[PDB]
Write a protein that binds this ligand. Structure first.
Ligand SMILES: [Ca+2]
Length: 147
């Protein structure tokens, strides 16, 4: 209802185009149905550009990492560590909304410094985990909220 990511389209990414289990769309649907309701990639870093169903004024940004979906629940070794959110401004320029460094938590729930109005948003995964033996990008949901 209030998460405004679901229905978003992928407009660009820096990952080889590839069918198709646990694709990018997995983190857009806002659900944790099962192990298959995430995005996972063997490429340990990269970015995703999405276009929301409409422009939104975003105040809050939530990421459900692997631990939130029941993977490595005890230690969080599979949880995304460094990752940033960018937005495309009115002039068409990408601007940094929020940088995260050193995360280990299952869920990151971040209020933005200020409300940001944009339709196109970018997630950049810098460091995909916290030293799990089975390294991968594993993101259950990318969620954002208006006031
Ligand atoms: Ca999901």
């Amino acid at each position: 209802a209030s998460n405004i990511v679901p229905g978003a389209t992928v407009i660009d990414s820096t990952f080889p185009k590839t069918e198709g289990g646990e694709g990018i769309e997995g983190m857009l649907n806002g659900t944790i149905t099962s192990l298959s309701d995430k995005w996972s990639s063997a490429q340990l870093s990269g970015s995703v550009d999405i276009r929301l169903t409409k422009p939104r004024t975003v105040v809050r940004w939530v990421m459900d990492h692997a631990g939130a979906g029941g993977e490595s629940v005890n230690d969080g070794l599979m949880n995304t560590k460094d990752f940033d959110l960018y937005y495309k401004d009115a002039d068409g320029e990408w601007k940094l909304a929020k940088e995260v460094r050193g995360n280990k938590a299952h869920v990151t729930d971040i209020t933005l410094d200020k409300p940001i109005t944009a339709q196109d948003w970018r997630l950049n995964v810098v460091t995909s985990d916290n030293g799990t033996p089975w390294k991968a990008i594993r993101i259950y949901n990318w969620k954002m909220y208006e006031k």
